[PDB]
């Protein structure tokens, strides 16, 4: 319950996605992407109320390449990081691999691609295709930054 209660507490205000289709899937992809932007923009607006407007994302015309910025705040000091990911052909079953290239200074990184907890993959698999890029940010990058950025600051690499 407690895995289930926690996820829900983090994402219940984020629009659930419905369409089970990846980039190759024509109108279903077009519909999927509209769900991605729907879910992304509500999260971002909710984040403004939370005084935790911690990321911007944008995509190419076909919505297969993503890039943007995240912001972490430690001891009142703000840190910015460039982020990117491509959409796997197998999305939304296969979660994308988020890259923070400029950190490629930490061991939790293979080219620029961060290393999430072993707990993320099962968490994503249990929810396919309801979770999207909003949830990847909310349940993946978010908790990663809360462990990684304090560690790197302490290690004097940031």
From Swiss-Prot:
The active site is at residue 115. There is a cross-link at residue 121 (Glycyl lysine isopeptide (Lys-Gly) (interchain with G-Cter in UFM1)). Changing residue 34 to A: Impairs binding to UBA5 and thioester formation with UFM1. Changing residue 48 to E: Decreased interaction with UFL1. The keyword Acetylation does not apply. Pfam families: UFC1. GO terms for cellular component: extracellular exosome. PANTHER family: UBIQUITIN-FOLD MODIFIER-CONJUGATING ENZYME 1. This is Ubiquitin-fold modifier-conjugating enzyme 1. It comes from Homo sapiens. The gene is UFC1.
